[PDB]
């Protein structure tokens, strides 16, 4: 459960991301595809090449949704209902995969928000991605 300190930390950190969230979404995907090649099984229809517009676009989409989650950090389940739906009944991504993207997201943030990526902020962001993961896979069965 996200503590008030956590919620603050997250809103701060994400606050800093700003106009770059789209780029960071894209970068996180790229790192995921390269580090955990099994994740590519879910994107056969994409051009997974570096700088692919499909990848960029998807990067934006994910980032945006994260944004929306930080904004409704208090009501995630409700804010992401549709997305939890899509994933459980359409996409059907295996839950193990959520942890890989989460990790690539930390790495990307760390590499971009040096000053802001403190030990306390790191812990919070992780918890947050974990909560987001739980929400997205809650209606799986």
């Amino acid at each position: 459960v996200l503590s008030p300190a956590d919620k603050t930390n997250v809103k701060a950190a994400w606050g800093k991301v700003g106009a770059h969230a789209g780029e960071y979404g894209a970068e996180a995907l790229e790192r995921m595809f390269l580090s955990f090649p099994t994740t590519k099984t879910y994107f056969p229809h994409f051009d997974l090449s570096h700088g692919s517009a499909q990848v960029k676009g998807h990067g934006k989409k994910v980032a945006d949704a994260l944004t929306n989650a930080v904004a409704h950090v208090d009501d995630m389940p409700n804010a992401l209902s549709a997305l939890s739906d899509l994933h459980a009944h359409k996409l059907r991504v295996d839950p193990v995969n959520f942890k890989l993207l989460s990790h690539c997201l930390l790495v990307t943030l760390a590499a971009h928000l040096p000053a802001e990526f403190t030990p306390a902020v790191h812990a919070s962001l992780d918890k947050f991605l974990a909560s987001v993961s739980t929400v997205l896979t809650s209606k799986y069965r």
Binding site: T38, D94, P95
Partner: protein, 146 residues
């Protein structure tokens, strides 16, 4: 694959008693039922809306038998699983796009299937041999992913 001679004999002695047709059908059906997300690979199999629709689906039964058939063959080459499974590994990756985690879920389900069928005969130690085996097979099937 750290199968001690005694673990290997144990895998093999039990495997002698298995009806791969039957077990294949059960393991695969059960996978689609416990982890419904795995149904993403079989949208052409028809009705998987309920446990009976899945367990009884003629297509699931036939596919299960195929899968366990391949697995059985693997059991005769415990020495060279990666070699044994290479073309299949490539197919699952490149053609089927099957997330490998699915191979681990099936292994666990299969272990529950063997427990269900053999009861007391599926001892703690027999389970441990089979645990090594399903893991080795899943690993072999994911070896060619890229």
């Amino acid at each position: 694959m750290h199968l001690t001679p005694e673990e290997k004999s144990a895998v093999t002695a039990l495997w002698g008693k298995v009806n791969v047709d039957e077990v294949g059908g059960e393991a695969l059906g059960r996978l689609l039922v416990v982890y419904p997300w795995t149904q993403r690979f079989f949208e052409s199999f028809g009705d998987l809306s309920t446990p009976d629709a899945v367990m009884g689906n003629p297509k699931v039964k036939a596919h299960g038998k195929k899968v366990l058939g391949a697995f059985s063959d693997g059991l005769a080459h415990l020495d060279n699983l990666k070699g044994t499974f290479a073309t299949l590994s490539e197919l699952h990756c490149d053609k089927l796009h099957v997330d490998p985690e699915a191979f681990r879920l099936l292994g666990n389900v299969l272990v529950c299937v063997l427990a269900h069928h053999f009861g007391k005969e599926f001892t703690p130690p027999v389970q441990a041999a089979y645990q090594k085996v399903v893991a080795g097979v899943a690993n072999a099937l994911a070896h060619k992913y890229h």
